[PDB]
Amino acid sequence: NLYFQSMDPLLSVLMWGVNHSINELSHVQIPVMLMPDDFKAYSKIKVDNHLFNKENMPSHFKFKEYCPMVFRNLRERFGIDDQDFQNSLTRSAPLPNDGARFHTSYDKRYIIKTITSEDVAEMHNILKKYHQYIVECHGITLLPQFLGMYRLNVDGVEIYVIVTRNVFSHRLSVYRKYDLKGSTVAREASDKEKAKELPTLKDNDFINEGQKIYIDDNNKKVFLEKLKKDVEFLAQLKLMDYSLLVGIHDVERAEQEEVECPLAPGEFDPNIDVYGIKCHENSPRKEVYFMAIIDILTHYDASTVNPEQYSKRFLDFIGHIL
Amino acid sequence: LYFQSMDPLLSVLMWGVNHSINELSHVQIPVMLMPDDFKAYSKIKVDNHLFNKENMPSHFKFKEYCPMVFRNLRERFGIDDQDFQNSLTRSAPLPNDSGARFHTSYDKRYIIKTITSEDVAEMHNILKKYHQYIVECHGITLLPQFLGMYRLNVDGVEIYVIVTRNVFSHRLSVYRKYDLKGSTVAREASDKEKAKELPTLKDNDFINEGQKIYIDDNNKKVFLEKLKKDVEFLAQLKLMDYSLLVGIHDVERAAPGEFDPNIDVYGIKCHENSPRKEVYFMAIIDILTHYDAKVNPEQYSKRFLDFIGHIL
Ligand SMILES: CC[C@@H](Nc1c(C#N)c(-c2ccc(-c3cccc(Cl)c3F)cc2)nc2cnccc12)C(N)=O
Ligand SMILES: CC[C@@H](Nc1c(C#N)c(-c2ccc(-c3cccc(Cl)c3F)cc2)nc2cnccc12)C(N)=O
């Protein structure tokens, strides 16, 4: 059964705190609708164990959840059941990707990131507009899905954490990934980065490697129409420096790595892998693309391009590569 | 389940038991308890801002004493942790009446009583010997079954709480109830006490009413043999001032007269030749008075056993 053990005590507190948060909400009514107070709310928990569970958990920790009712409503609006979320974040420890550091949930559904107190403050600044935007697009958006936000304290180490939905497939592997922005001199992966297993490539890598993305005219028009709305919303909030993250699944590469070791090859569940787009019938390779916006929370007040200019250049760059 | 109550302390108790048991489901059942488990505790302090402001208090603390020991006790007494959690939280405990106050779980399986910090210290003082006594008698005893001990804090007020098992049936009504000590001293329920629906009657009430408990020779032997061993243990811990609690169920006022002895563990049916079809619920309560509060514990125990033997 579930002990929340880790060598990383901050991961043990995160798994414990998500378990607690979700069980607590099981004892709080789902309201007709969110109110203003729900956007300034928190729950704080301080645990002090003495000679109790001293093996599998730290004895002294704090866990704080920001606006629990709002993130619960956001999970529901993005089609995520709270018990599934709880199992994803607690049944086995999140895995490190190894400042660039992130974790993935064990089942690769969710991304966990350490954020600053400035981030948390900016999150509260946008949370009402973000929530209403999610309402009006019926949860259909390329924006990050913010699913939970927490503060952890153990051993005198304080961190803030955000949980988002993975852009990539929980099952289909990515052999190539790009963080894309536009209009940035020398924006390309370092030598050390390109030497890794799965490098995070960037704008000049995408251009200089001849990267194409083969989606049909309909999927392109639907995708670019969402991007425009989402990026216009970000520019209204005065946000900038966001990326399009692009993951490519190569069906025949994935297949050759199985032979070394029921959805058909290249098929995915669009209710789980929500950012997936199939290639068109004339791709030179059978590929599946995963594409969405990440990393939105830079406010213009914090060469300085303005958010209008950033949004136009970004849309122009993505439009010119597809 | 929102743990709502007019009494904030009851919400905290229900939230706390709920949290306690869920937490223990994330903790291994040890091969055996160790000395540290008898000096252990869990503390949680909750501070909510504009969250769950309707059901629950926004600021509270909950401490569980020796959670590993009370979990083991619950198992040794044939109690599943999810049934226990259910009994204490599906619906608020009900107050007996209104120091003498107690609550009953909503399903009448358990007793919840506010105790002093002095009680909490004396429970820690006896708990290793009590646990090892429960091991030795295989959970067969008329002692109080100590199932959980806690400290609650809400809105400036702090209380300590013990949970025990109901001596009485979760189903069968008691029409008559005695607190018996064998004090040759005066022990009579008050006129106020006696005006109630169910008075707590005492030694001299039992004598003056000529109350009879008709048990067959085998049940009485087994019962007095347990009582002897239990009372000799109490005297060895230098505990005194405990009572036999006796509840009488009247079957004719009505299958009638039957009960599950895995739930109502203190039930004993009457002699077939009893002039009334009764069922008796009898066990020891209220053991935590140490002689060091200064008739001695040996004398108390012998005078106690003699009186119970006297009445059957
Ligand atoms: C390039 C990104 C990296 N992987 C990430 C990645 C990160 N880091 C993120 C991510 C980025 C930034 C933030 C974030 C920062 C500050 C404040 C707030 Cl509120 C935030 F939300 C959260 C999550 N999301 C991903 C989604 N799916 C797949 C891969 C992803 C990688 N190297 O592959
Ligand atoms: C006769 C007393 C009352 N009913 C009680 C009753 C009480 N009070 C108790 C009880 C008494 C004392 C304590 C107690 C005090 C101090 C410290 C510690 Cl550690 C204790 F455990 C706990 C529980 N147990 C009962 C069991 N079954 C049926 C009726 C019961 C009643 N009036 O009916």
Summarize the structure in words.
- The structure is a homodimer.
- Chain A has 322 residues and is an alpha+beta fold.
- The radius of gyration of chain A is 20 Å and the shape is globular.
- The longest helix of chain A has 20 residues.
- The first copy, chain A, has two domains: 166 residues, Phosphatidylinositol Phosphate Kinase II Beta, CATH 3.30.800.10; 154 residues, 2-Layer Sandwich (Phosphatidylinositol Phosphate Kinase Iibeta, Chain: A, domain 2), CATH 3.30.810.
- In chain A, 36% of the residues are buried.
- At the A-B interface, helix 1 and strand 1 of A face helix 1 and strand 1 of B.
- The structure holds the ligand CC[C@@H](Nc1c(C#N)c(-c2ccc(-c3cccc(Cl)c3F)cc2)nc2cnccc12)C(N)=O (2 copies).
- The site of one ligand P4Z has 20 residues of chain A, from strand 5, helix 4, strand 7 and strand 8.
- The PDB classes it as transferase.
Structural class of chain A: alpha+beta
Can you say what the CATH homologous superfamily of the largest domain in chain A is?
Phosphatidylinositol Phosphate Kinase II Beta
> What's the CATH architecture name of the largest domain in chain A?
2-Layer Sandwich
- Tell me the radius of gyration of chain A: 20 Å
Distance between the termini of chain A: 47 Å
CATH classification, class level of the largest domain in chain A: Alpha Beta
Shape of chain A: globular
Q: What is the total domain count of chain A?
A: 2
Oligomer: homodimer
Name the beta content range of chain A. 15-25%
- Percent of residues of chain A in helical segments? 25-40%
Ligands, ions, cofactors:
ligand P4Z
Subcellular location (chain B): Cell membrane; Nucleus; Lysosome; Cytoplasm
Keywords (chain B): Acetylation, ATP-binding, Cell membrane, Cell projection, Cytoplasm, Kinase, Lipid metabolism, Lysosome, Membrane, Nucleotide-binding, Nucleus, Phosphoprotein, Transferase
Subunit structure (chain B): Homodimer. Interacts with PIP4K2B; the interaction may regulate localization to the nucleus. Probably interacts with PIP5K1A; the interaction inhibits PIP5K1A kinase activity.
Enzyme class (chain B): transferase
